[PDB]
Write a protein that binds this ligand. Structure first.
Ligand SMILES: [Mg+2]
Lengths: 166, 166
């Protein structure tokens, strides 16, 4: 199971791809990791355009069966949420064009899947991702690490028949 | 002066194109009008993919010099700011690909441009749009009418040399 995970946001976009074992305990190989960066010196449409281009390239190169993103919750819907939405919109256009389905999981679902319970610390999730990927050191930077956590979260729920389409 | 206007939304997205003409009072011809509709029965990527497709075709075909969008982030919102963000992401990707600069205006700026002051009734804006376009009756449907108001708001500021890049 090849899964792309993505972590959007304002200035960075984490983009990772893992190949998960079809059987046994949750275990995966890291195929790709990057962070798409933005420039304050380019128009908004350039930032979003770059995200689309990079996501499409990764979807093309690795042909994942799924794209996984965080199900974003906001206490307040405002311009901040709107701008995170721009980045996800670019991801969705790429997924549409590449023919890859998209799934979303809440932050507590990630914590539960990777560190055992919904109140687990982000640090414990990071350590478990390191373990699942068989890595000497945990992935850096945090944006990439978060994208990988979401990809592995999808794989976990997909295996037990509870994947969550977006 | 060819301008595309967008009334953003995920379930409904208004998309209009006007050609502003002459050396006098604001006057325009309607070149194109549509409302893109998407449903919560559909995957997010299909909804956003449709919006991107319809907007990009219009940008390619009509060669506007500008795409103008309304922005509003009051507490009450017709659709979640996050999801309106998805739609805007699609618009931005389209504008990036077509090489058309993007501009944004709030309801106060629309009212100032088309009705003379920031507290004018929406109905006064609607009446002015009808007048500028030389129409007996105001354009329909409502999402299209709102998109046209945004396009003409941009045209007004553009003529003044005070347009507002996104
Ligand atoms: Mg509308």
């Amino acid at each position: 199971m090849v899964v792309a995970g993505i972590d959007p946001g304002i200035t960075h976009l984490g983009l990772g791809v893992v190949a998960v074992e079809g059987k046994g305990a949750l275990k995966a190989r890291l195929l790709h990791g990057e962070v798409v960066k933005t420039s304050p010196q380019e128009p908004a449409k350039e930032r979003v355009g770059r995200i689309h281009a990079r996501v499409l390239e990764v979807l093309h190169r690795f042909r994942p069966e799924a794209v996984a993103v965080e199900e974003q919750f906001f206490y307040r819907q405002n311009e901040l949420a709107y701008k995170v939405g721009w980045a996800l919109g670019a991801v969705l256009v790429a997924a549409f064009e590449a023919g890859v389905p998209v799934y979303a999981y809440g932050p507590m679902q990630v914590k539960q899947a990777l560190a055992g319970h919904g109140h687990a610390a982000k640090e414990e999730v990071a350590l478990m991702v390191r373990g699942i990927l068989g890595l000497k050191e945990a992935p850096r930077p945090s944006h990439l690490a978060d994208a990988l956590a979401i990809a592995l979260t999808h794989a976990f729920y997909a295996r037990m028949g509870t994947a969550k389409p977006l």
